[PDB]
Amino acid sequence: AEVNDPRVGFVAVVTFPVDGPATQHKLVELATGGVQEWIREVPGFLSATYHASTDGTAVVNYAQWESEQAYRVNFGADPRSAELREALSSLPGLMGPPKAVFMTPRGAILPS
Amino acid sequence: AEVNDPRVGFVAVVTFPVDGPATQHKLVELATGGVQEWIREVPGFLSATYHASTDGTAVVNYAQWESEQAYRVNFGADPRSAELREALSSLPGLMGPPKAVFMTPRGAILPS
Numbered sequence: 001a002e003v004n005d006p007r008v009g010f011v012a013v014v015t016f017p018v019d020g021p022a023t024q025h026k027l028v029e030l031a032t033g034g035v036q037e038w039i040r041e042v043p044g045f046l047s048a049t050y051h052a053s054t055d056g057t058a059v060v061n062y063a064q065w066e067s068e069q070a071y072r073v074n075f076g077a078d079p080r081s082a083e084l085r086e087a088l089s090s091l092p093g094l095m096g097p098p099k100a101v102f103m104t105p106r107g108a109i110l111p112s
Numbered sequence: 113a114e115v116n117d118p119r120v121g122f123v124a125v126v127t128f129p130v131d132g133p134a135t136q137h138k139l140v141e142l143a144t145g146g147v148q149e150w151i152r153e154v155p156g157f158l159s160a161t162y163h164a165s166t167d168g169t170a171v172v173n174y175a176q177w178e179s180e181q182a183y184r185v186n187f188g189a190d191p192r193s194a195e196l197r198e199a200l201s202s203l204p205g206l207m208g209p210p211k212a213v214f215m216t217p218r219g220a221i222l223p224s
């Protein structure tokens with residue numbers, strides 16, 4: 001969704017530490033390769049965007065959710081979220097567990 | 113911009129460690145201030161979305177740019193950006209220097 005859409009009530013920023021750009025590429029390919037097709041229809045799921053850090057050390061996911069409850073009930077309480085975590089943790093090149101930060105949009109600056 | 117808009121060639125995720133929920137509002141208020149409107153007309157700027165960590169300890173800015181040059185020079189060479197940095201660094205309640213992670217969007221999972 002647009003980054004400043006009011007429907008976005010909850011965001012998770014997840015950082016995955018990797019051993020270099022080849023693993024960055026593989027990790028994004030894995031994340032968008034069909035393992036999480038099921039998440040697209042989850043009520044409250046708005047988006048998951050995966051980025052490669054320019055220094056080659058991490059893959060960052062910026063995920064928008066309609067609310068914390070929707071995230072908790074429709075993602076965290078679904079066992080398929082554990083399946084997803086296992087999938088992404090299986091990749092060679094992943095150097096530590098993913099780190100998450102939870103947060104709510106509070107202000108924005110859009111273009112003129 | 114939409115998170116998967118093809119114009120977004122470069123993203124910065126800037127984290128500002130703060131001492132509490134009160135300073136989070138102060139920091140967002142300052143950063144989305146109104147004197148900061150010149151940023152809206154910077155060539156290549158697409159969006160700045162300021163978030164408050166749910167735990168009250170951080171303010172996180174997800175910023176969309178057309179390219180790394182737009183951020184670095186169009187924004188970064190303008191003196192107003194140095195002004196803005198100093199402003200943010202001088203706010204009481206800051207627990208340390210802002211930390212930026214630079215990255216490129218590589219893939220997105222979205223609802224149909």
Ligand SMILES: O=C(O)Cc1ccc2c(c1O)C(=O)c1c(O)cccc1C2
Pocket residue numbers: 124126151159160173175183196197200210211212
């Ligand atoms: O200079 C730093 O590293 C700290 C720091 C302070 C203020 C800002 C930034 C920043 O990075 C940004 O990036 C940034 C951006 O990308 C898009 C919009 C506003 C800011 C404001």
